[PDB]
Design a protein around this ligand. Structure first.
Ligand SMILES: COC1CCN(c2nccc(Nc3cc4[nH]c(-c5cn[nH]c5)cc4cn3)n2)CC1
Length: 296
């Protein structure tokens, strides 16, 4: 098929400055930083993710997939630094992941924000389908928040989360774009429940039998039958019966026009989250967001 003419940028260690640590886990550590290219007179806020040969291959594969994407609703790789450890330099998503965001801000999250997020993920996911790319790990934890009004899909480690997986993926290890639709349904559930753990208390081994019986995630209280019907269609046994991402864009977009008709949240409209129209929302001299920094 079509040759992958993507450019992999090798960035110098001296070109960027690791401000602090955002979080550490099993993978290693993710830092907050600033990338100052050559003599460009720009400071780009970045996320730096940093020896065994096997771990280097895994991180280099994520870099390959990440450099091979370009969509406003997908995280792009800004470059890699070939140090003793090796690290992926990516766009800083200041508000962290959407799963933690909905949990920490439920009292200010309105129907407009929720439906708009659903559109943005369906759009990001429809892009990956265009680029013939199966995500295999879509969840609210793998959707990052640039601004409360702008989210992006991330984590291209896969290109096992049983509670996010389709039945074919659990039983036969089949991963299709329609298997991502199931994970999308679960992601939407995560958001509408403001961060609830799907199938809470139920062990992962029981999930397979539960779905086979016909059991599915409950109707979130804020959800109308219109929204829950979409979530249900995403969880069909027949993958071809599930909606396409191009249809999920259309469906959530229609709804996002009149949000209060499709999501019932007490105190809606009066609620507000930070915006570029806020006081001190963002040296702050010559700081540009990655989305505005492009080399020819
Ligand atoms: C799992 O442990 C922690 C990792 C860092 N977390 C965080 N806190 C604040 C901002 C932020 N921004 C951020 C995070 C990012 N993570 C990735 C990434 C995707 N795949 N691999 C790394 C890109 C990216 C951009 N901004 N992240 C908190 C949880």
């Amino acid at each position: 098929e079509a040759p992958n003419q993507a450019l992999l940028r090798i960035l110098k260690e001296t070109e960027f400055k690791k401000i602090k640590v955002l979080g550490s886990g099993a993978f290693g550590t993710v830092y907050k930083g600033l990338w100052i290219p050559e003599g460009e007179k720009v400071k780009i806020p970045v996320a730096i993710k940093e020896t065994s040969p096997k771990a280097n291959k895994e991180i280099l594969d994520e870099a390959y997939v990440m450099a091979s994407v370009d969509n406003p609703h997908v995280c792009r790789l800004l470059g890699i630094c070939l140090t003793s450890t090796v690290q992926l330099i990516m766009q800083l998503m200041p508000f962290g992941c959407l799963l933690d965001y909905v949990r920490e801000h439920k009292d200010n999250i309105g129907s407009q924000y929720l439906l708009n997020w659903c559109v943005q993920i369906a759009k990001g996911m429809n892009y990956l389908e265009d680029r013939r790319l199966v995500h295999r790990d879509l969840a609210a934890r793998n959707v990052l928040v640039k601004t409360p009004q702008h989210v992006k899909i991330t984590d291209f480690g896969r290109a096992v989360p049983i509670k996010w997986m389709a039945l074919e993926s659990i039983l036969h290890r089949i991963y299709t774009h329609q298997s991502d639709v199931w994970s999308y349904g679960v992601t939407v559930w995560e958001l509408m429940t403001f961060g609830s753990k799907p199938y809470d208390g139920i062990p992962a081994s029981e999930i397979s039998s539960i779905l086979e019986k016909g059991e599915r995630l409950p109707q979130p209280p804020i959800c109308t039958i219109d929204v829950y019907m979409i979530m249900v269609k995403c969880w069909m046994i027949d993958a071809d019966s599930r909606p396409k991402f191009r249809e999920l864009i259309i469906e959530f977009s229609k709804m996002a026009r009149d949000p209060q008709r499709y999501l019932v949240i007490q105190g809606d409209e009066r609620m507000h989250l930070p915006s570029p129209t806020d006081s001190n929302f963002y040296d702050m001299d010559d700081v540009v967001d990655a989305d505005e920094y492009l080399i020819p």
